[PDB]
């Protein structure tokens, strides 16, 4: 709408904002974050991972 | 968005499904002797007997 300027998700945490130059709608997506996780056979027996 | 991850389980829904189709069938055909040892046949109705 021409009022809102700023949109929340469900859990109330922004999914959408207006440019303020120009008067357009973006989906703000976070960066992409993951868990690295290593996979690797016993020291003794080798040293790949 | 704020750092929870959900992991998926080891085993999907069809490998579940198969593990009961297998048990299922087990129990179909051999009674209750696969469960104590080898799958030993016996007809059904001298099963139900």
Known sequence: ?49 | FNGLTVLPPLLTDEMIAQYTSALLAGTITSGWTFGAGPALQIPFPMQMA
């Open chain 1, 1 to 49: 709408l021409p009022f809102q300027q700023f949109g929340r998700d469900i859990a109330d945490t922004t999914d959408a904002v207006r440019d303020p130059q120009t008067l357009e709608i973006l989906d703000i997506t976070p960066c992409s974050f993951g868990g690295v996780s290593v996979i690797t056979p016993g020291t003794n027996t080798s040293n790949q991972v």
